[PDB]
Amino acid sequence: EELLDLFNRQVTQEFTASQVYLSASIWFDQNDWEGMAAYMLAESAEEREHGLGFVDFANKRNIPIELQAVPAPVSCAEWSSPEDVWQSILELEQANTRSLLNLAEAASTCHDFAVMAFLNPFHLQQVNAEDKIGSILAKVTDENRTPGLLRSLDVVSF
Amino acid sequence: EELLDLFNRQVTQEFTASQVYLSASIWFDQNDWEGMAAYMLAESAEEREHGLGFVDFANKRNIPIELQAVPAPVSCAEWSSPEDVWQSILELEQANTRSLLNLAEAASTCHDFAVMAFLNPFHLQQVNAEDKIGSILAKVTDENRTPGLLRSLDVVSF
Amino acid sequence: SEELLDLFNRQVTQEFTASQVYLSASIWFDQNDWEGMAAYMLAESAEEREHGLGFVDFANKRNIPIELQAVPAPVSCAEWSSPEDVWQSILELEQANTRSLLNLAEAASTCHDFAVMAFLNPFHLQQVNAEDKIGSILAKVTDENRTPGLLRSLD
Amino acid sequence: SEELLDLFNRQVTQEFTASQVYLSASIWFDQNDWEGMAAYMLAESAEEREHGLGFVDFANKRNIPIELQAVPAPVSCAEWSSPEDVWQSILELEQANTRSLLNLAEAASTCHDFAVMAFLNPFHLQQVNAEDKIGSILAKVTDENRTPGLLRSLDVV
Amino acid sequence: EELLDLFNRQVTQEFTASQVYLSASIWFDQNDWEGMAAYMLAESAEEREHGLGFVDFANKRNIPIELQAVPAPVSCAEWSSPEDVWQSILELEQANTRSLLNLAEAASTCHDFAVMAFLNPFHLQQVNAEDKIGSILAKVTDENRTPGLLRSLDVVS
Amino acid sequence: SEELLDLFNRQVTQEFTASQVYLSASIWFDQNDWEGMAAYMLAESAEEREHGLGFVDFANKRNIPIELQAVPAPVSCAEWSSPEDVWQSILELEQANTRSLLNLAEAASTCHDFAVMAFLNPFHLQQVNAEDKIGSILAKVTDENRTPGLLRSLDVVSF
Ligand SMILES: [Fe+3]
Ligand SMILES: [Fe+3]
Ligand SMILES: [Fe+3]
Ligand SMILES: [Fe+3]
Ligand SMILES: [Fe+3]
Ligand SMILES: [Fe+3]
């Protein structure tokens, strides 16, 4: 079953994203962006919570879950500035949205109304996540035009 | 794109509805039905809030909103009793409902799960609204069979 | 449209039917001195009645004619002889409850009745939880009843 | 004795029957935009079910075997055309409810079943109150319904 | 009466300004200036409240009100930066002020003391509004001389 | 010190690996209607992840570069068929967690890295408590499961 493999994968995607968020916190912390680091860390925990929510529903609905490996984050090796980090995070959220939409498609094809109902809050959370990340990225990109100015986004606002 | 156009039209319909409700408040106040007036004023505000909720979601989801003219209400030229006003308000809500349904249809066809999730509470609200306005119109039509009687219940209820 | 309106009317019957079966289970348990299991069944009986009354309220608001049907006599109680038999029947009840909701949602879907489908969502998720809760209780009951008297300690 | 046990089972059914009849009254009232009277009937529907539950509880304690019967479909609601028709059916229902409790009490009395007679006492008094209140409402409805629209006033109370 | 047509006009002008504020909110939100967007959204609501205030007064004083179309905001098509938006909003407020002054003019010629009294707080509100928009626009125009810096006005409020 | 810097990195991986193993135990228990044991495992999964994050934080402060590695898929779950099997695996996991900390501490001792040793101290004591508590639960489980049904009683009662 496709629906069931995709549900598994979704758990994996949430934990993958949690680890990518953690990688972002690390790069920020190492480069003394403690505000952006705390934001990424908080998002890491929340992504893990989403994974757990998927796990709990699957268990209730007798969808067998077998935990997969959580792949090592790869984009950190390339990051040179906060702009690069926030852009990777945007891509991560876009990919998170795409995987949920694929899972919803499979559910819709199966007439699985319970799964579709379960996913609705996630669909709306993704809209809010891509908007928030996108907006932060816009701010960072604008402020990084003047040397040192972005270092005030961090200290003040986050 | 059909879903962008319909999403924009939904915004217009909410604000059109807001103005129609305001027109109703005005007719009521000018004819000394202050309770019925207060109710229409409350609704006018709430319809505008729905509109703002659509705009907010559209902004987040990158659906470009271009605000359109809000047309002049016209039913208020033909009103001559409260019954006429409540009947037009029922028909407004029926058109608000139809319009949400067209939107949902477009989103369904596009497999736009986030838009469909967003609309759900509005579908349920429209059930409530058509029911509440139907009920008031029934009461108005019944009480208006005895002279003076309708007036005694603007003054009490509302 | 006719099919959707009659399935909605028959969902009310299903909810009340399930209420009565829960009540039946409560009775068997009380008669056989399982007051803890009887209390649980009595609470679910009230809750299934409330679900019915939710369906009724919604139909009234959406102008779906409701005509209340006979609520059938519960019949599994004639054959229950252990708690296990009762909880197995309640599990079957919930699985049937789930299928009737899914059929209704299937007819709404066909009719493009977005409002009805939205109404049903919380109920689909409630049935997921109900089947899981019942299934778990039955697993426990089945395991504990392997030793004489032990199940009496769960109650 | 057999007859007493029969009648006790029956009473449970009668309570749940009346619960459904009150629900049918709520429905007709809601459908016809009498939300106040519909609220009233809904609350009574709940209450009748609680009475039935109290009989089941007692029977279980006293080892009167109960076996739940079908709850018949309400029938009056097909022919109601105005609130007067509904309140009239509900008065009859309560009148019927009183008769079955009195019959059950007769059977208990013949058996010298003092515990059953004691259990029934608060219900006999509740039935007096119920018939009084329903009768009183029916009287208002029937009076106020002589002026078009005036009964809609009662409902907003 | 010109006095009556101008009073109706004024309602349309308050609602037009509400819609124009809403269009500025949208442009800001779409361009990730969430602080400016919130500010414009609150002003949109307040202009609607002013309109509603004129409507209520007109009803009380038997000034027949007939609601006009609220035209579509047009400046938003050409905005490219926050400076452009704020400049349009200043122009809206200036227009808002002239219209109130024209209404007061008509009221004065008619010796309509009640309308003049009703308008007093709005005249003083407009002085405040022009001053406040003018001051934000001066900050915006100054800060936008250094790339990124304006993005700090938004974030700090 | 590269040995030190690698072992520290590997310790993060070990804490997150343990987090996932505890999640897998939680899942087994839930699937098999042991909701009390499943809650306990879930709690422990969060706690191990917290330890991992504490090691990350200290590394960042101390300029020990952390590069996150793959967190391996739990595999003991395939073999579990009773709660005893699950708790046995979790004992062995903790024993492994203990050995990894001790090896890290050895490396820090060789390097005279007093700050790393001081940092590890609370974890060494936590590991004593952890092994003791899992070992104790495993003893109870093993005893109660000698009578059919009895172990259920103590998922539902206790936990
Ligand atoms: Fe997520
Ligand atoms: Fe609306
Ligand atoms: Fe149910
Ligand atoms: Fe009764
Ligand atoms: Fe103004
Ligand atoms: Fe650890």
Residue numbers in the entry:
A (entry chain D), B (entry chain E): 2 to 159
C (entry chain H): 1 to 155
D (entry chain C): 1 to 157
E (entry chain A): 2 to 158
F (entry chain G): 1 to 159
Quote the passages of the study that discuss this structure, keeping the authors' original sentences:
Glu-130, a ligand that can coordinate iron at both site B and site C, was substituted with the non-coordinating residue alanine. Two structures were obtained from E130A PmFTN crystals soaked for 5 min (E130A Fe (5 min)) and overnight (E130A Fe (o.n.)) in aerobic Fe2+ solutions, respectively. The structure obtained from E130A Fe (5 min) has iron bound solely in site A (data not shown). Iron was observed bound to site B and site C in E130A PmFTN, showing that Glu-130 is not essential for iron binding at either site. Remarkably, mineralization in the E130A variant occurred more rapidly, with an initial rate of 40 ± 1 μm Fe2+ min−1, ∼10-fold faster than in wild type PmFTN. In ferritins, such as human H-chain, in which the ferroxidase center functions as a gated site for the transfer of iron into the central cavity, the mineralization rate at lower iron loadings can be interpreted as a measure of the flux of Fe3+ through the center to the central cavity. Consistent with this model, partial regeneration of the initial rapid oxidation phase was observed in E130A PmFTN. Thus, Glu-130 plays a key role in regulating the flux of iron through the ferroxidase center, and we propose that it does this by coordinating Fe3+ at site B such that the rate of exit from the ferroxidase center is limited.
